[PDB]
Amino acid sequence: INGNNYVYIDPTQLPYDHKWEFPRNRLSFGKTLGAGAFGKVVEATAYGLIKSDAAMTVAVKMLKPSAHLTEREALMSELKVLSYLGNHMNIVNLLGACTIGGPTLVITEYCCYGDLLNFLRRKRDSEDDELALDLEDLLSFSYQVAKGMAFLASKNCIHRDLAARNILLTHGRITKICDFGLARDIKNDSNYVVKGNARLPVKWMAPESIFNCVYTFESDVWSYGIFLWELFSLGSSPYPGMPVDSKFYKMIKEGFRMLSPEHAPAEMYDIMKTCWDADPLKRPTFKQIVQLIEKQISEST
Amino acid sequence: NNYVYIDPTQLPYDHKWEFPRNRLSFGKTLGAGAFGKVVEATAYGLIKSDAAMTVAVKMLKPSAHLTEREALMSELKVLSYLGNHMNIVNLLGACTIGGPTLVITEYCCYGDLLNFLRRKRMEDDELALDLEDLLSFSYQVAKGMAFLASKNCIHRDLAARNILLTHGRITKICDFGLARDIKNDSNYVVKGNARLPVKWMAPESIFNCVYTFESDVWSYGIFLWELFSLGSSPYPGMPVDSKFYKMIKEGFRMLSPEHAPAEMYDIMKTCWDADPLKRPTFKQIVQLIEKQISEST
Ligand SMILES: CCc1cc(NC(=O)Nc2ccc(-c3cnc(Nc4cc(N5C=CN(CC)C=C5)ncn4)s3)cc2)no1
Ligand SMILES: CCc1cc(NC(=O)Nc2ccc(-c3cnc(Nc4cc(N5C=CN(CC)C=C5)ncn4)s3)cc2)no1
């Protein structure tokens, strides 16, 4: 009933606080975790970031020399976003930043097990206690990601690229929503398709985003549905055996949708299908998804 | 450590645990020995009267004699005295009226850790996450045993076969006791008039079958060995014979499992000290493992 659903925070018109500033000379860079044309996240050690005595593993997002103005402003707005979100268990959390003394460096938590997609596909490489425990993990991942997106929505942020490749897994099997953004080489990732002037994750995108470039809280919900499908498919790409071409676009428009993964619980597939309503007003909110999944987890115990 | 116990015949039965026998719907047999079995059940109105809950029930077969019936009642009294802990199988209720004793506890949905460890098969991330699980199980069992000794309770048969795994990879210490077929389990060896888990027992316990808090710490060390070796049985290629007993007395100890962190093998080695007074308590082990997990982040 709220007006909060019709408004988003514009990261441009957001403000950076200097509590985060941290001396870049006390960073020891390590292995590169991800890289695209203009950007990279690198694993690093931060000395005295939390307790003045102890070093600490972190992740640092930075740009390559190849980057021009528009990426410099994008990294700034992302640093502002991260600063404005604060802390949630299921989002990558900002820890600090270096905007003086050189190029922008965005300092956040490091997730030690990488992205969920590669986790799922290693599992894919293969009644039963082991299958039950694996199903319990996937239920947990779907719950944690719904809670993290609910938090994002409550702060009026739209993710725009929700997918298993943008979910990180860390100690305790905690999942954190991230956005590799410029630190992903989308040119060589075939999940990103040329559409007009841009390279877009078409198979995760709601029809309003594909045909009208409309992004809203409810188009994030559509992407969440695709994520559940790849989650319960152990990371196979959506609409398998099907290129993104004119036939794909016509098929989404005419109302074809994916069948359930074999080992998706019926109620999780029910959520998926409501996420894929062509009418955004009929999709559940993330707050609603969280409510439904909690019931599923509680009944499972 | 203390050196005192209370025997179960001196503990009470709080009849607030009483549950109507007619509300159990018995399911698959979880484990059975000669005189007793544990079966999965549905209990209606056990925590709140609205709906039901999956539980586990330990009971005796018609074969049981008076001594097994006393033992089950004694087990019930111990679980009542113990109280609740996250890393113990907890009492939920009991049937003692109108029929034989039924002891109702939590059902652990993934079975015992030994079978879980043995069913295993690798990229670095998968290795790391498996190691994180093994450290967690180490910590959780040490916390559970820390709780047992704080209640002056001695387990006597701590082993991976007596650790259960359930939702969230929470481990619960249990004891199938009479619900294990110990004559057909080669990990229990004839010793005098009993079949005993001699490979898990401390040397000092073998003389007169005396169990202590420090011999539980010895068994925990053996447990760590089967944990980090993914469930292989201890002292490979060494049957329990005259030479086994001799070799332990002379000081022979198991080498480290290949995937044990050197700090966890150091714990094992202190657990196997020939002088029980030099072994760590479980409280100290909990503190040591807390540090290891904390640094791993
Ligand atoms: C609210 C949404 C949002 C996001 C955003 N920006 C935003 O997240 N940037 C951003 C910041 C930080 C990160 C990362 C943090 N930790 C990471 N760890 C790994 C580990 C890994 N391994 C692979 C393999 N192995 C052993 C073989 C170990 C590790 N591979 C790849 N990454 S990557 C990602 C993105 N702004 O808003
Ligand atoms: C404080 C120390 C102490 C303990 C004590 N007594 C004491 O523990 N009794 C006692 C009570 C309860 C239990 C059990 C509780 N849940 C259990 N679940 C399973 C599940 C399972 N599965 C196998 C396979 N599959 C695939 C279909 C699924 C499941 N297999 C075996 N068991 S067994 C054990 C013993 N007294 O003192």
Side-chain angles (χ1 to χ4, degrees):
Chain A
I1 325 304
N2 67 339
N4 218 62
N5 169 50
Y6 305 83
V7 120
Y8 77 103
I9 182 75
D10 195 308
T12 66
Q13 184 32 29
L14 213 45
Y16 174 92
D17 192 317
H18 274 284
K19 342 153 196 187
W20 301 100
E21 270 286 339
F22 155 97
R24 91 180 50 219
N25 84 88
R26 327 169 62 109
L27 289 169
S28 175
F29 290 137
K31 60 207 167 54
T32 302
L33 304 171
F38 306 115
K40 84 212 307 179
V41 189
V42 80
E43 208 209 3
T45 324
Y47 298 88
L49 178 54
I50 306 301
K51 271 188 45 156
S52 320
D53 319 333
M56 178 189 188
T57 312
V58 299
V60 193
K61 208 195 240 158
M62 47 186 326
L63 314 171
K64 293 182 163 177
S66 150
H68 283 87
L69 169 63
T70 59
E71 300 69 15
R72 203 173 311 125
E73 261 147 39
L75 184 59
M76 190 56 53
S77 320
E78 142 173 25
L79 164 72
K80 312 268 281 290
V81 162
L82 285 174
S83 167
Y84 153 85
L85 293 172
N87 197 290
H88 194 271
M89 180 57 64
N90 301 116
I91 318 282
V92 183
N93 293 326
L94 180 73
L95 297 164
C98 323
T99 62
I100 330 172
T104 308
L105 313 179
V106 180
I107 282 165
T108 70
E109 325 173 311
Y110 168 73
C111 294
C112 57
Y113 296 131
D115 65 289
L116 208 45
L117 179 65
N118 283 349
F119 179 89
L120 291 171
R121 292 193 178 203
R122 282 153 19 207
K123 234 78 179 279
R124 184 175 82 179
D125 284 358
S126 286
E127 190 122 346
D128 189 283
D129 298 308
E130 218 71 11
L131 301 183
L133 186 50
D134 281 352
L135 171 61
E136 175 190 313
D137 284 345
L138 303 178
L139 264 183
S140 172
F141 299 156
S142 79
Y143 182 43
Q144 292 180 251
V145 169
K147 278 193 278 184
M149 291 301 296
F151 179 71
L152 274 186
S154 77
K155 298 298 278 223
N156 307 272
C157 292
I158 299 156
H159 185 298
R160 311 171 63 112
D161 195 5
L162 176 62
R165 61 180 174 270
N166 278 328
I167 307 291
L168 304 171
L169 187 74
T170 189
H171 290 112
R173 291 186 182 72
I174 298 315
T175 55
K176 283 157 183 283
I177 300 162
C178 74
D179 182 20
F180 273 95
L182 291 175
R184 173 176 289 112
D185 175 36
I186 53 183
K187 272 215 147 176
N188 291 287
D189 190 325
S190 41
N191 299 299
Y192 294 77
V193 180
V194 161
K195 189 179 154 26
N197 44 284
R199 222 151 191 129
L200 301 187
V202 168
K203 283 192 181 180
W204 282 258
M205 288 171 62
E208 59 259 37
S209 314
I210 287 176
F211 307 108
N212 318 309
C213 309
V214 165
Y215 293 80
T216 67
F217 304 113
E218 286 318 303
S219 63
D220 268 3
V221 171
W222 178 292
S223 296
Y224 175 78
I226 306 288
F227 163 70
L228 294 185
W229 191 95
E230 71 192 315
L231 191 59
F232 287 105
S233 305
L234 306 183
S236 67
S237 46
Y239 312 85
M242 195 172 275
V244 179
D245 48 23
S246 39
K247 283 152 181 113
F248 182 86
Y249 294 124
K250 184 181 210 174
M251 169 248 265
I252 294 300
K253 216 173 319 164
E254 295 185 355
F256 300 86
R257 304 288 189 266
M258 282 181 283
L259 294 173
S260 169
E262 205 45 76
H263 301 118
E267 274 143 271
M268 292 297 166
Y269 184 56
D270 286 329
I271 291 174
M272 270 181 244
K273 290 200 288 165
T274 64
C275 291
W276 304 332
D277 202 310
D279 182 359
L281 288 186
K282 292 215 233 294
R283 302 174 201 160
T285 67
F286 281 115
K287 189 184 290 278
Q288 287 163 344
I289 296 177
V290 163
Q291 281 272 66
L292 295 168
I293 296 193
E294 288 180 347
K295 298 173 47 210
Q296 296 184 45
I297 286 175
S298 56
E299 279 65 337
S300 148
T301 68
Chain B
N1 269 321
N2 275 349
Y3 208 69
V4 290
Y5 79 106
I6 185 162
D7 60 310
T9 51
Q10 308 217 73
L11 299 180
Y13 173 44
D14 212 343
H15 317 82
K16 322 320 134 175
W17 294 110
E18 205 61 29
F19 183 73
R21 184 169 314 256
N22 45 306
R23 297 168 155 190
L24 298 184
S25 198
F26 291 116
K28 206 64 214 76
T29 58
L30 300 183
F35 307 130
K37 63 180 168 201
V38 169
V39 291
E40 159 167 30
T42 306
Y44 299 79
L46 176 66
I47 190 94
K48 198 87 205 253
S49 35
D50 262 306
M53 162 188 21
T54 305
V55 297
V57 178
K58 175 183 285 184
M59 58 193 302
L60 295 185
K61 315 215 234 199
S63 74
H65 322 293
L66 177 52
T67 186
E68 285 76 42
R69 305 148 53 193
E70 317 194 295
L72 185 49
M73 182 60 55
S74 277
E75 179 177 326
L76 171 46
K77 321 211 181 142
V78 174
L79 301 177
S80 192
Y81 165 82
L82 218 35
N84 184 92
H85 191 272
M86 175 58 46
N87 303 292
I88 302 307
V89 166
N90 300 291
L91 191 61
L92 300 170
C95 314
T96 61
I97 289 162
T101 303
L102 308 168
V103 177
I104 300 162
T105 78
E106 308 169 313
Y107 166 77
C108 299
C109 67
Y110 297 129
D112 76 283
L113 212 54
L114 176 82
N115 282 355
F116 176 89
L117 294 169
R118 283 183 178 177
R119 293 161 182 232
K120 288 234 162 300
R121 106 187 69 176
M122 255 184 66
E123 283 237 38
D124 270 6
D125 283 317
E126 292 266 279
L127 268 200
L129 173 66
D130 286 338
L131 182 55
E132 170 182 344
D133 286 334
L134 299 186
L135 260 295
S136 189
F137 300 154
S138 294
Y139 184 45
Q140 284 184 80
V141 169
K143 284 196 279 162
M145 295 299 300
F147 178 76
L148 284 195
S150 72
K151 304 312 252 292
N152 293 107
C153 176
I154 291 153
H155 188 295
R156 308 187 161 211
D157 196 5
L158 174 71
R161 64 178 165 279
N162 275 325
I163 306 303
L164 299 168
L165 185 77
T166 193
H167 292 309
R169 303 201 173 55
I170 302 291
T171 53
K172 317 272 222 168
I173 298 162
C174 71
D175 183 4
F176 282 86
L178 298 172
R180 179 178 286 110
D181 185 354
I182 52 163
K183 75 162 171 133
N184 300 335
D185 192 327
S186 48
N187 308 278
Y188 295 74
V189 314
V190 284
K191 206 210 148 45
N193 32 65
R195 314 184 151 269
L196 305 184
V198 161
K199 283 192 177 174
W200 287 255
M201 292 168 64
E204 70 265 18
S205 296
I206 296 289
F207 296 87
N208 295 275
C209 276
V210 166
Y211 301 93
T212 70
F213 303 96
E214 297 95 328
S215 68
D216 270 352
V217 164
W218 179 290
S219 307
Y220 176 82
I222 306 284
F223 160 71
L224 287 187
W225 191 91
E226 29 193 4
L227 186 55
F228 281 95
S229 80
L230 303 189
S232 37
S233 59
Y235 306 96
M238 285 188 43
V240 174
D241 59 39
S242 150
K243 188 178 206 190
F244 174 87
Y245 294 120
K246 290 178 162 151
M247 283 200 274
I248 300 300
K249 315 299 157 156
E250 178 44 50
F252 279 101
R253 294 313 185 248
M254 271 188 298
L255 302 145
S256 174
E258 281 92 342
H259 285 102
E263 307 219 85
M264 295 299 302
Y265 184 51
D266 296 350
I267 291 179
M268 284 166 155
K269 291 191 293 183
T270 68
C271 286
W272 303 333
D273 203 288
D275 175 14
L277 272 36
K278 284 175 196 130
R279 312 180 186 140
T281 64
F282 285 115
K283 273 43 137 163
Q284 299 174 300
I285 292 173
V286 165
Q287 280 314 105
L288 286 170
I289 298 185
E290 243 163 59
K291 211 157 114 79
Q292 286 182 50
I293 293 169
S294 99
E295 277 147 13
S296 284
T297 304

